[PDB]
Amino acid sequence: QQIDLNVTCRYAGVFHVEKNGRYSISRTEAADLCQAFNSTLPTMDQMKLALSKGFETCRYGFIEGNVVIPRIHPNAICAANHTGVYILVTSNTSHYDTYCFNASAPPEEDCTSVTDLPNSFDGPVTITIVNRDGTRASKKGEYRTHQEDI
Ligand SMILES: CCN1CCc2c(N)cccc2C1
């Protein structure tokens, strides 16, 4: 009963979250997960400002409307040498990572550690926030509000 949530630096309030280091989040769960961080799924605009603040990943994730990978440096194995916000057009499958957006975040680069999931509710799961620099916060809770995701 244990979930790792892997989080990135927030850029203009937009961060990256992987569940258990693999693509295993539905669109419904993307909403619930972000809402546990007191966040909403980003709009394209919020993501485009996130990107200009110096944000990139090598992983597909949900935003408001699409599944995307933000890209600064052209790389062959990430979104296929594309730069800017790369939109996934064709895919058989539903589960990816997610992006979230906290409006309370600093306006640019925020590479401080995330030490809480301030709005998770009561549950039996161990939920471990896992940071890029390795630091951890664990709490017993739940965030999934749709049974089809549990
Ligand atoms: C699998 C690549 N991801 C990269 C993202 C990430 C983060 N953000 C935090 C901890 C581990 C990881 C690993």
Short mmCIF file of all heavy atoms in Angstrom, two decimals, residues 104-146:
data_model
loop_
_atom_site.label_atom_id
_atom_site.label_comp_id
_atom_site.label_asym_id
_atom_site.label_seq_id
_atom_site.Cartn_x
_atom_site.Cartn_y
_atom_site.Cartn_z
N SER A 104 0.33 29.64 -5.98
CA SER A 104 1.14 30.09 -4.83
C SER A 104 2.65 29.97 -4.99
O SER A 104 3.40 30.47 -4.16
CB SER A 104 0.77 29.27 -3.59
OG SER A 104 -0.22 29.91 -2.82
N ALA A 105 3.09 29.27 -6.03
CA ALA A 105 4.52 29.03 -6.25
C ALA A 105 5.30 30.31 -6.63
O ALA A 105 4.69 31.29 -7.07
CB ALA A 105 4.69 27.94 -7.31
N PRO A 106 6.64 30.34 -6.42
CA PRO A 106 7.40 31.46 -6.99
C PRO A 106 7.25 31.54 -8.51
O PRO A 106 7.04 30.51 -9.16
CB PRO A 106 8.86 31.14 -6.59
CG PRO A 106 8.72 30.36 -5.32
CD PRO A 106 7.45 29.54 -5.47
N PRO A 107 7.34 32.76 -9.06
CA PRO A 107 7.10 33.05 -10.48
C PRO A 107 8.08 32.45 -11.49
O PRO A 107 7.76 32.38 -12.67
CB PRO A 107 7.18 34.58 -10.53
CG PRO A 107 8.06 34.94 -9.37
CD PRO A 107 7.64 33.99 -8.31
N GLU A 108 9.27 32.06 -11.04
CA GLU A 108 10.26 31.48 -11.95
C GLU A 108 10.72 30.09 -11.53
O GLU A 108 9.88 29.24 -11.20
CB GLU A 108 11.45 32.43 -12.14
CG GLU A 108 11.31 33.31 -13.36
CD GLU A 108 11.77 34.73 -13.13
OE1 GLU A 108 12.24 35.05 -12.01
OE2 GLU A 108 11.63 35.53 -14.07
N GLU A 109 12.03 29.84 -11.56
CA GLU A 109 12.61 28.57 -11.10
C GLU A 109 12.44 28.40 -9.60
O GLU A 109 12.80 29.28 -8.83
CB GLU A 109 14.09 28.46 -11.49
CG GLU A 109 14.86 27.30 -10.81
CD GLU A 109 15.96 26.74 -11.70
OE1 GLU A 109 15.68 26.51 -12.89
OE2 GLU A 109 17.09 26.50 -11.22
N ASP A 110 11.86 27.28 -9.20
CA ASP A 110 11.78 26.91 -7.79
C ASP A 110 12.27 25.49 -7.67
O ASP A 110 11.51 24.54 -7.86
CB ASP A 110 10.34 27.02 -7.26
CG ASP A 110 10.23 26.67 -5.78
OD1 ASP A 110 11.26 26.72 -5.07
OD2 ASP A 110 9.11 26.35 -5.31
N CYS A 111 13.56 25.35 -7.38
CA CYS A 111 14.15 24.03 -7.19
C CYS A 111 14.37 23.69 -5.71
O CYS A 111 15.31 22.97 -5.34
CB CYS A 111 15.43 23.87 -8.02
SG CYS A 111 15.10 23.71 -9.79
N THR A 112 13.51 24.22 -4.86
CA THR A 112 13.45 23.78 -3.47
C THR A 112 12.65 22.47 -3.40
O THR A 112 11.86 22.17 -4.30
CB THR A 112 12.84 24.86 -2.55
OG1 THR A 112 11.55 25.22 -3.04
CG2 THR A 112 13.73 26.10 -2.50
N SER A 113 12.86 21.70 -2.34
CA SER A 113 12.19 20.41 -2.15
C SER A 113 10.73 20.60 -1.76
O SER A 113 10.37 21.57 -1.10
CB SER A 113 12.90 19.56 -1.09
OG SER A 113 14.26 19.33 -1.43
N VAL A 114 9.88 19.67 -2.20
CA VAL A 114 8.47 19.63 -1.81
C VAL A 114 8.32 18.68 -0.63
O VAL A 114 8.64 17.48 -0.74
CB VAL A 114 7.55 19.22 -2.98
CG1 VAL A 114 6.12 19.06 -2.48
CG2 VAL A 114 7.59 20.26 -4.08
N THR A 115 7.85 19.22 0.50
CA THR A 115 7.79 18.50 1.77
C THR A 115 6.39 18.09 2.23
O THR A 115 6.23 17.59 3.36
CB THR A 115 8.47 19.33 2.90
OG1 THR A 115 8.21 20.73 2.71
CG2 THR A 115 9.99 19.07 2.93
N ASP A 116 5.38 18.31 1.39
CA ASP A 116 3.99 17.96 1.73
C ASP A 116 3.07 17.81 0.52
O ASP A 116 3.35 18.34 -0.57
CB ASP A 116 3.38 18.96 2.73
CG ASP A 116 2.12 18.41 3.46
OD1 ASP A 116 1.86 17.17 3.42
OD2 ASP A 116 1.39 19.22 4.08
N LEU A 117 1.99 17.07 0.73
CA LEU A 117 0.88 16.93 -0.20
C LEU A 117 -0.26 17.56 0.58
O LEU A 117 -1.12 16.85 1.12
CB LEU A 117 0.62 15.45 -0.46
CG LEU A 117 -0.42 14.96 -1.46
CD1 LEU A 117 -0.02 15.34 -2.86
CD2 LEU A 117 -0.56 13.46 -1.34
N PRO A 118 -0.27 18.91 0.65
CA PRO A 118 -1.04 19.64 1.67
C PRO A 118 -2.54 19.31 1.72
O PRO A 118 -3.18 19.59 2.73
CB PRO A 118 -0.81 21.11 1.33
CG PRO A 118 -0.27 21.13 -0.05
CD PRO A 118 0.39 19.82 -0.31
N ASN A 119 -3.06 18.68 0.66
CA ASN A 119 -4.50 18.48 0.53
C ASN A 119 -4.93 17.04 0.22
O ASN A 119 -6.02 16.81 -0.30
CB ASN A 119 -5.10 19.45 -0.49
CG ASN A 119 -6.59 19.61 -0.34
OD1 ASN A 119 -7.10 19.91 0.75
ND2 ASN A 119 -7.31 19.38 -1.43
N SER A 120 -4.07 16.08 0.52
CA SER A 120 -4.49 14.69 0.52
C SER A 120 -5.44 14.51 1.69
O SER A 120 -5.37 15.23 2.69
CB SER A 120 -3.30 13.76 0.68
OG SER A 120 -2.55 14.10 1.83
N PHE A 121 -6.35 13.55 1.54
CA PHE A 121 -7.30 13.23 2.60
C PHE A 121 -6.99 11.88 3.22
O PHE A 121 -6.00 11.24 2.86
CB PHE A 121 -8.75 13.31 2.10
CG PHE A 121 -9.02 12.53 0.84
CD1 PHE A 121 -9.29 11.16 0.90
CD2 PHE A 121 -9.04 13.18 -0.40
CE1 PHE A 121 -9.57 10.44 -0.28
CE2 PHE A 121 -9.31 12.48 -1.59
CZ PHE A 121 -9.57 11.10 -1.53
N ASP A 122 -7.85 11.46 4.15
CA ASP A 122 -7.70 10.26 4.98
C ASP A 122 -7.73 8.98 4.14
O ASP A 122 -8.61 8.81 3.27
CB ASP A 122 -8.80 10.25 6.07
CG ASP A 122 -8.74 9.03 6.98
OD1 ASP A 122 -7.90 9.02 7.90
OD2 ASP A 122 -9.57 8.11 6.80
N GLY A 123 -6.76 8.10 4.39
CA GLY A 123 -6.62 6.83 3.67
C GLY A 123 -5.51 5.99 4.27
O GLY A 123 -4.79 6.47 5.15
N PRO A 124 -5.35 4.72 3.80
CA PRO A 124 -4.35 3.84 4.41
C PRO A 124 -3.01 3.80 3.67
O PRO A 124 -2.02 3.30 4.21
CB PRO A 124 -5.03 2.47 4.34
CG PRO A 124 -5.97 2.57 3.10
CD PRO A 124 -6.08 4.03 2.72
N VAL A 125 -2.97 4.35 2.46
CA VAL A 125 -1.77 4.33 1.63
C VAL A 125 -0.65 5.15 2.25
O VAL A 125 -0.90 6.21 2.81
CB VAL A 125 -2.06 4.87 0.22
CG1 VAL A 125 -0.90 4.58 -0.74
CG2 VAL A 125 -3.35 4.26 -0.31
N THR A 126 0.58 4.64 2.17
CA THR A 126 1.76 5.46 2.47
C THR A 126 2.07 6.25 1.19
O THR A 126 2.32 5.68 0.12
CB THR A 126 2.99 4.62 2.90
OG1 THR A 126 2.65 3.76 3.98
CG2 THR A 126 4.18 5.53 3.31
N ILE A 127 2.02 7.57 1.30
CA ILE A 127 2.30 8.40 0.14
C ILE A 127 3.60 9.13 0.41
O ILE A 127 3.72 9.90 1.36
CB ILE A 127 1.10 9.33 -0.22
CG1 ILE A 127 -0.12 8.48 -0.60
CG2 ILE A 127 1.46 10.26 -1.37
CD1 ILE A 127 -1.43 9.22 -0.51
N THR A 128 4.59 8.81 -0.42
CA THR A 128 5.93 9.35 -0.25
C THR A 128 6.18 10.32 -1.37
O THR A 128 6.26 9.92 -2.53
CB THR A 128 7.04 8.25 -0.29
OG1 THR A 128 6.96 7.45 0.90
CG2 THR A 128 8.43 8.86 -0.35
N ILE A 129 6.29 11.59 -1.01
CA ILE A 129 6.81 12.61 -1.92
C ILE A 129 8.29 12.31 -2.11
O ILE A 129 9.06 12.29 -1.13
CB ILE A 129 6.64 14.05 -1.35
CG1 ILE A 129 5.25 14.27 -0.71
CG2 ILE A 129 6.95 15.07 -2.41
CD1 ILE A 129 4.14 14.57 -1.68
N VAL A 130 8.69 12.08 -3.35
CA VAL A 130 10.10 11.84 -3.66
C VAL A 130 10.67 12.99 -4.49
O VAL A 130 10.21 13.24 -5.61
CB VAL A 130 10.31 10.52 -4.42
CG1 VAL A 130 11.80 10.22 -4.54
CG2 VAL A 130 9.59 9.39 -3.76
N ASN A 131 11.68 13.66 -3.96
CA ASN A 131 12.32 14.78 -4.67
C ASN A 131 13.48 14.34 -5.56
O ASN A 131 14.04 13.27 -5.38
CB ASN A 131 12.79 15.85 -3.68
CG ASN A 131 11.62 16.52 -2.97
OD1 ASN A 131 11.02 17.46 -3.50
ND2 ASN A 131 11.27 16.02 -1.78
N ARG A 132 13.82 15.19 -6.52
CA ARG A 132 14.94 14.92 -7.42
C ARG A 132 16.27 14.77 -6.68
O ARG A 132 17.07 13.89 -7.02
CB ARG A 132 15.02 15.98 -8.53
CG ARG A 132 15.96 15.67 -9.70
CD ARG A 132 15.70 14.32 -10.35
NE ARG A 132 16.24 13.21 -9.56
CZ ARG A 132 16.30 11.93 -9.96
NH1 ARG A 132 15.88 11.59 -11.17
NH2 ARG A 132 16.80 11.01 -9.16
N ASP A 133 16.50 15.60 -5.66
CA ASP A 133 17.72 15.48 -4.85
C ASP A 133 17.62 14.37 -3.79
O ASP A 133 18.50 14.23 -2.94
CB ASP A 133 18.13 16.83 -4.24
CG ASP A 133 17.25 17.25 -3.07
OD1 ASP A 133 16.52 16.39 -2.53
OD2 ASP A 133 17.30 18.44 -2.69
N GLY A 134 16.54 13.60 -3.83
CA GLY A 134 16.40 12.42 -2.98
C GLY A 134 15.65 12.58 -1.67
O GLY A 134 15.24 11.59 -1.06
N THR A 135 15.47 13.82 -1.22
CA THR A 135 14.77 14.06 0.04
C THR A 135 13.31 13.60 0.01
O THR A 135 12.65 13.64 -1.04
CB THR A 135 14.88 15.52 0.51
OG1 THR A 135 14.48 16.40 -0.54
CG2 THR A 135 16.30 15.84 0.83
N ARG A 136 12.81 13.16 1.16
CA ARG A 136 11.51 12.49 1.25
C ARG A 136 10.59 13.00 2.35
O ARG A 136 11.04 13.41 3.42
CB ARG A 136 11.72 10.98 1.42
CG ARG A 136 11.87 10.24 0.10
CD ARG A 136 12.37 8.82 0.26
NE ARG A 136 12.97 8.37 -1.00
CZ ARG A 136 12.35 7.59 -1.88
NH1 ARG A 136 11.12 7.13 -1.63
NH2 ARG A 136 12.97 7.26 -3.02
N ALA A 137 9.29 12.97 2.06
CA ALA A 137 8.25 13.15 3.08
C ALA A 137 7.19 12.08 2.89
O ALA A 137 6.65 11.89 1.80
CB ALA A 137 7.65 14.54 3.00
N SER A 138 6.91 11.34 3.95
CA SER A 138 5.92 10.29 3.89
C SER A 138 4.70 10.62 4.74
O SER A 138 4.82 11.15 5.85
CB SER A 138 6.53 8.97 4.34
OG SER A 138 7.46 8.52 3.37
N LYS A 139 3.53 10.32 4.20
CA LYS A 139 2.29 10.48 4.95
C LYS A 139 1.32 9.37 4.57
O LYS A 139 1.32 8.85 3.45
CB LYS A 139 1.68 11.89 4.77
CG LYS A 139 0.77 12.08 3.55
CD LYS A 139 0.40 13.55 3.33
CE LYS A 139 -0.58 14.11 4.40
NZ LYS A 139 -0.91 15.56 4.22
N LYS A 140 0.51 9.00 5.55
CA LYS A 140 -0.55 8.03 5.38
C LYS A 140 -1.80 8.79 4.90
O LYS A 140 -2.31 9.68 5.60
CB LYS A 140 -0.77 7.32 6.71
CG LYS A 140 -1.38 5.95 6.65
CD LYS A 140 -1.85 5.50 8.05
CE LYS A 140 -2.82 6.52 8.73
NZ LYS A 140 -3.67 5.89 9.79
N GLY A 141 -2.27 8.48 3.70
CA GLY A 141 -3.42 9.15 3.13
C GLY A 141 -3.97 8.51 1.88
O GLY A 141 -3.70 7.34 1.59
N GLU A 142 -4.74 9.30 1.13
CA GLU A 142 -5.37 8.91 -0.13
C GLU A 142 -5.60 10.18 -0.96
O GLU A 142 -5.72 11.27 -0.39
CB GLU A 142 -6.70 8.19 0.16
CG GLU A 142 -7.50 7.72 -1.05
CD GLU A 142 -6.73 6.75 -1.92
OE1 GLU A 142 -6.55 5.58 -1.51
OE2 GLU A 142 -6.30 7.17 -3.02
N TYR A 143 -5.65 10.06 -2.28
CA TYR A 143 -5.98 11.21 -3.14
C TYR A 143 -6.95 10.86 -4.28
O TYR A 143 -7.60 11.75 -4.84
CB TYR A 143 -4.71 11.89 -3.68
CG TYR A 143 -3.88 11.00 -4.58
CD1 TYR A 143 -4.08 11.01 -5.96
CD2 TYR A 143 -2.93 10.14 -4.05
CE1 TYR A 143 -3.34 10.17 -6.79
CE2 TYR A 143 -2.19 9.29 -4.86
CZ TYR A 143 -2.40 9.32 -6.23
OH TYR A 143 -1.67 8.48 -7.03
N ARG A 144 -7.05 9.56 -4.61
CA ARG A 144 -7.93 9.03 -5.69
C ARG A 144 -9.43 9.02 -5.34
O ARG A 144 -9.86 8.32 -4.41
CB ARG A 144 -7.49 7.60 -6.07
CG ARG A 144 -6.10 7.45 -6.70
CD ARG A 144 -5.52 6.03 -6.54
NE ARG A 144 -5.35 5.67 -5.13
CZ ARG A 144 -4.90 4.50 -4.67
NH1 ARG A 144 -4.56 3.53 -5.50
NH2 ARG A 144 -4.80 4.30 -3.36
N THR A 145 -10.24 9.77 -6.09
CA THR A 145 -11.68 9.85 -5.80
C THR A 145 -12.57 9.04 -6.75
O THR A 145 -13.80 9.11 -6.64
CB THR A 145 -12.18 11.32 -5.76
OG1 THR A 145 -12.07 11.89 -7.07
CG2 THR A 145 -11.39 12.16 -4.77
N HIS A 146 -11.95 8.30 -7.67
CA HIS A 146 -12.67 7.48 -8.65
C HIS A 146 -12.23 6.03 -8.52
O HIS A 146 -11.06 5.72 -8.74
CB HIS A 146 -12.40 7.96 -10.09
CG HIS A 146 -12.84 9.37 -10.36
ND1 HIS A 146 -14.13 9.68 -10.74
CD2 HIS A 146 -12.17 10.54 -10.33
CE1 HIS A 146 -14.24 10.98 -10.93
NE2 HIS A 146 -13.06 11.53 -10.69
#
